[PDB]
Amino acid sequence: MENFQKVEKIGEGTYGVVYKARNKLTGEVVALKKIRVPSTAIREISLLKELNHPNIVKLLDVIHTKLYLVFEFLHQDLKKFMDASALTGIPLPLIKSYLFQLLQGLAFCHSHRVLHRDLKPQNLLINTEGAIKLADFGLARVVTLWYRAPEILLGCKYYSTAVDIWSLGCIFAEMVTRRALFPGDSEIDQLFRIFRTLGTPDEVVWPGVTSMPDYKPSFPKWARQDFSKVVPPLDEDGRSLLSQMLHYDPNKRISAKAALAHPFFQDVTKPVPHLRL
Numbered sequence: 001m002e003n004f005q006k007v008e009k010i011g012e013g014t015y016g017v018v019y020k021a022r023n024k025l026t027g028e029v030v031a032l033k034k035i036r037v038p039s040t041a042i043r044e045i046s047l048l049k050e051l052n053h054p055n056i057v058k059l060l061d062v063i064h065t066k067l068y069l070v071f072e073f074l075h076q077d078l079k080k081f082m083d084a085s086a087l088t089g090i091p092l093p094l095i096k097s098y099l100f101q102l103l104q105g106l107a108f109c110h111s112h113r114v115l116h117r118d119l120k121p122q123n124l125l126i127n128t129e130g131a132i133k134l135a136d137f138g139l140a141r142v143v144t145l146w147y148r149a150p151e152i153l154l155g156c157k158y159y160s161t162a163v164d165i166w167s168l169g170c171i172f173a174e175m176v177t178r179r180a181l182f183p184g185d186s187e188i189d190q191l192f193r194i195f196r197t198l199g200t201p202d203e204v205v206w207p208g209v210t211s212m213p214d215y216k217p218s219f220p221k222w223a224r225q226d227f228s229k230v231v232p233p234l235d236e237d238g239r240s241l242l243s244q245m246l247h248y249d250p251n252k253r254i255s256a257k258a259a260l261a262h263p264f265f266q267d268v269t270k271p272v273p274h275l276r277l
């Protein structure tokens, strides 16, 4: 740690505090995450050094002296960008570029059997070039519940790569509407917010749902709403893709690979964001 000069705090993540820091030897500006150490964690974290992709924040070094992760420094997070763009909204071409790149990053991770499990605007990092990257990929294996897949909330112990698709669908809706899709403040409020918009799931739409650990027959039965009401500024291609990212059954939910082939991305481009740094 004597090699790093902390500049400022840049976040307080799930499993530790994130700092902007300067490497005293190279002059490199990095993000330093101090982990809140088991042998299993050291081995699991070391495998993440090899998981390199243009849409994944580069994990430069792992320092075990208690545990520090040295990441490449991006200039802004998507939460700050969304807040800065709240008056006019993020232009649709930029939303589509960001969604397409995040799907590319997810397709890469998922092909290597690596799940994020906690996607949220605060861990999506952007640069002046138009790139967007996934941060904290693989760390999991006030807490925000807004992006949690329904199978996690219902007690599924062995959830799949579909959880990340659900989280990215929620973020996509939020970029488009400028409001969080499901802003729950408890696990039950999060579940019931999902049910109120998408309909209470049953055996018809989600075979096996009624046998899930936390499913209760006593759940209220709400009807599903149309996506025209859910995401109005989003064209029909965007709405059909979103609906497939938010399918209740994780087995029916679109994969990142199939989502990349969706007609919504026929006219994808890579615009430059207007970033105020």
Ligand SMILES: CN(C)CCNS(=O)(=O)c1ccc(-c2cnc(N)c(C(=O)Nc3cccnc3)n2)cc1
Pocket (backbone or CB within 6 Å): 009, 010, 011, 013, 014, 018, 030, 031, 033, 057, 071, 072, 073, 074, 075, 076, 077, 080, 081, 122, 123, 125, 135, 136
């Ligand atoms: C807290 N606010 C008020 C200040 C920082 N906001 S920001 O948008 O200017 C910002 C956010 C994040 C990063 C940054 C850069 N490179 C990184 N590599 C990371 C990073 O790894 N972040 C992260 C987030 C959550 C959990 N773990 C890591 N963050 C830089 C600027």
